[PDB]
Symmetry: D2
Subunit: 335 residues, 4 copies
């Protein structure tokens, strides 16, 4: 034994998409807002991330958070998302996990009906509710950033074989790129992964050329890191089924929070029975996220809605990672 | 299984007298100063202390702490000390403890010659210097709050046995009654411990709520709470031994950093010790702290001295405490 | 960090009197019978016991065990009990402990009404029946080794105080001196504990190496080692209280299953108790075992009775003990 | 918190290829030989495996062992390999890990020079040596089963584009299938994974048709589950570099023990400077295994050698997996 470093994480799976919630092993991180500490992390500790998110600890499609000091009064605690490619500003399937764990472990004093909790992200402070059955969490609704559509139609170019064919782009907290099942020839199922993943990243990269758009408000993030594919379900109590590509080439095991929070737009201004209507969006693996909306905030330059998404996270063990200082791969290695 | 609350501690021992350093299972406490953090703990989440310090988890003696976010400028993380009986404003084995582990587990980036780490009691911030021999920590050298003689001798009381007479009172993080082993007829040895305990608290009671206890600054304290007895040593190296009684009726196995730092800060104001002059305080259990007297500096009332005490802590396992909600002792029990 | 040895235990408490159940950090001991396994432990890897039972890790009292591979036919896993002073051939709170956890953590496939688990002391195999209320364990009901009156009263000795006279001796997993609280002038209360301890061991010494200690079968034992004192209860429910002294000078906080199982196995051979007849033994700490007297069966010398004692254990956290090789107390210390 | 199950694992990475060494959470497994317990595991517990080896805990290319009771005298302990597709009979990169951990953690009492250790696999008992530098493991040589070649030339069929082209087949403890870099057009590097993996499994499956051979001795295992591709290094202190496909479609991050133990055959009967000659075989990721041989056992029907392979394993944290009984994915899910 040597190790030199020792980080305590808690694993969750949020409808299939894993989350490593680091709890103990780094007590304070300087910055004022989560962005300030984020910058500090990305600049000073940075690639603790690599170690936990890459092999031989994690894998390509691994994802996780860091619980921290609030700094902002209000109450609760601070979170910082992360993945094989760096850090997410929001992850939704992270906000659920993080919340579900916190309460289940303690950290947040739990109620009998439903325990509200506000967590500090680098992006906006996030409102998770978590309904509990006397003792334990049943599922979390996380209220999402106002989401909208950037353009109607799209089409550009696809390497093989059709060449052309219409698509669609929107927001969701981060932008997105959505298409249909009928053009390439895919049936979103576990078996065919490679064509989707391999078609996904080239579509991501080649719409970073000049179509690339910045939304009104917040000028820093630009163009696409999230490619999306609908089809509609193979499971009865559902209505759509969809996969999402991102993160140095990784994929989401859940229907995609930020993704779904964006999709359930469109059908607000496209005539599909509007507010407080039931919608259950399911993943490629085949697991459910409930979506529904409330406020519908137009405001000039766009038309937008403030979407409420729900899901379930479960605890899949407790970790105490350590870093043999001779281990030459002690940090990450990418593949 | 079912638990509801699950807290991640790190067992250390510091010349005996172990410390359970809490690391994980609570992420936040807005506080401001580490006393306004301590206050919050005692008036809210005290039910932790009862759990870990008392049986079945802890025992009569048994000491620990909590790592925090600092708020305080620079301050590398900030700490709170706790025992079966309540919370110590400061603790020299508790500090020495926290320091070692923090560096050992990589919570602190470890410097190669000596690692300077600042922690927040908030009995001032404290500057621990952690010596590391290429690979490993050699020893800690914690520089403490200014220490002084408070009132001088005063008169003793009876219940048992005989009204008796002389002793002394002095501060060094908390307030101490420093009396000779002869003055009441004790020999610092395991055979008598029971007596020293039963004696100390009965004293610690009846020299409170009869007298004037106060600190030139920080207000609040107005409580000794710490009874220190002293005789010569059965070790050539050591200069003096001592036991310390506090918290419900619990004893230190280390010479008591705060206790020693207070004693030698009565000397010099006596002339038996001058600046540096190697000092080595011993406990009951053949375990020693290598004191010295660096710099004077009065305290806005009467003259004083900042002392640096030195010692060694060792990591004695990693704990994930959990509390079965049916378990009636869930929050420990007294005896 | 650097440790070299890292052992994985599971803290439980069984009506107080905690048990550290070792689970992980050693995988094998060829032994044959669980005594030939115990032998090996004590003549080799005893340095574990000193570590976990003594300070800094454990304390004066503090009890634990080890889960093993059985070898023995059927036997679901097999156990070894241990304390600060050495190893108990059998223990009713140590058994009740092991049972609960084993089922609780899923080591045993948990049956819904009642879960029958066989463990190997090897003070015989023992049949614990673990009641589970749909989700959770309600209580354990361990059926023990045949118990009996051994020699009857005999005469007491002095050192302190007064030579005195009557008492009794009886077996129930180990050998007990069962004497009244009146017989030496004690009241079973925390205030006196110190006396009961100091008394018990001085007795436990001087009623050994002066007398005839022996078991009709299994040979070897030829040692009491367990002093049991008894008075009436300050509880309506409870029928009798008791304390038990053993191992270097340590006390039980449970009524002492093995201790109680031995006491009521002197009654009936007396006529104050017959088959079933609800019995409830209490400790010093307001904690009770619900005894009964099921079936006779002599012991190849003199008549005897197999008693079933019942109680409750709770999981009080999970430990990964580690031993810094520089740490001079690495293997604990005495006081 | 609920979980119902709680398995303690220790993670390693053996030159990139991960290993989850389960230690605590299942104390005894019935069977006599490791095959008997294996059969028992595969039949009764089975898909604890799925949970730990599949997502959301593990991933497709995850691999691990189970430490157990020896049963066989000799000494030490029992191991059982496992992966997403079931169980391996040998894994070499498992035998190293397992050994490296055991000693590093304790479990096996360690020496000053080199600590021999014999572990019970379902296949033959395995001899790992582990050289240690006063305190810590430097690297393990594991002595491998007698390995040989089944046929010289091969060629069969490849879907695109050449159609034909020569290859080669051998043993290694398990069979294998080896080819060159020059025929399809691949440069074994992280970037191009998919073509190799996708070309690998179809080559695996379509040489399970009737070419399928059983080696002399042990009639149970048949044909191929291991496809292999040499090229030779991009790293100076090496001589070959090679990737290996298997396990429901997974891949090896290390040069492949059983694989390499087979390859370093051929060059014993093909004139390449024979016994006790240095050979370092490196992986697709680019990390070294040392191979060299000793005995060369011809025996009629084949010509064979008993190969000695070396490597390094490092500890990448300690796990305490748990299985929320409501979590619908609580066990595995494949992709
Ligand atoms: O669900 C989300 O919010 C998300 C972010 C990145 C991938 N999914
Ligand atoms: O080491 C000390 O200073 C201390 C505080 C309480 C007991 N010992
Ligand atoms: O509960 C018991 O039987 C026991 C054994 C040792 C102390 N208590
Ligand atoms: O290295 C080995 O022995 C092995 C077995 C399966 C894959 N690699």
């Amino acid at each position: 034994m040597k190790f030199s470093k020792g980080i305590h994480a808690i694993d969750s799976h949020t409808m299939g998409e894993p989350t490593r919630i680091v709890v103990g092993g780094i007590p304070q991180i300087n910055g004022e807002t989560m962005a300030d500490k984020k910058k500090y992390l990305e600049d000073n500790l940075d690639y603790v991330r690599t170690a936990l998110m890459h092999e031989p600890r994690g894998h390509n499609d691994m994802f996780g958070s860091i619980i921290t000091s609030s700094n902002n009064k209000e109450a609760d605690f601070g979170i910082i998302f992360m993945d094989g490619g760096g850090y997410l500003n929001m992850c939704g399937h992270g906000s659920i996990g993080a919340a579900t764990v916190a309460v289940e472990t303690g950290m947040v004093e739990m109620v009998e009906p439903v325990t509200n909790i506000n967590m500090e992200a680098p992006a906006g402070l996030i409102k998770a509710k978590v309904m509990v059955e006397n003792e334990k969490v049943k599922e979390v609704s996380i209220t999402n950033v106002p989401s909208f559509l950037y353009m109607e139609d799209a089409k550009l170019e696809v390497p093989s074989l059709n060449k052309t064919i219409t698509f669609d782009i929107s927001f969701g907290g981060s932008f997105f790129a959505i298409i249909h099942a009928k053009e390439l020839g895919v049936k979103v199922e576990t078996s065919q992964v490679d064509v989707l993943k391999k078609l996904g990243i080239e579509i991501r990269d080649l719409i970073n050329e000049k179509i690339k758009v910045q939304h009104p408000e917040l000028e820093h993030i630009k163009t696409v890191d999230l490619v999306e594919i609908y089809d509609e379900p193979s499971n009865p109590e559902a209505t759509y089924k969809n996969v999402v590509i991102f993160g140095q080439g990784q994929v989401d095991r859940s229907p995609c929070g930020t993704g779904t929070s964006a999709k359930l737009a469109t059908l607000y201004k496209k005539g599909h029975l509007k507010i407080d209507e039931k919608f259950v969006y399911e993943s490629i693996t085949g697991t459910m996220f409930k979506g529904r909306v409330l406020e519908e905030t137009k405001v000039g330059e766009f038309d937008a809605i403030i979407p409420e998404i729900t899901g379930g996270a479960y605890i899949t063990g407790f970790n105490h990672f350590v870093i043999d200082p001779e281990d030459p791969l002690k940090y990450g290695f990418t593949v």
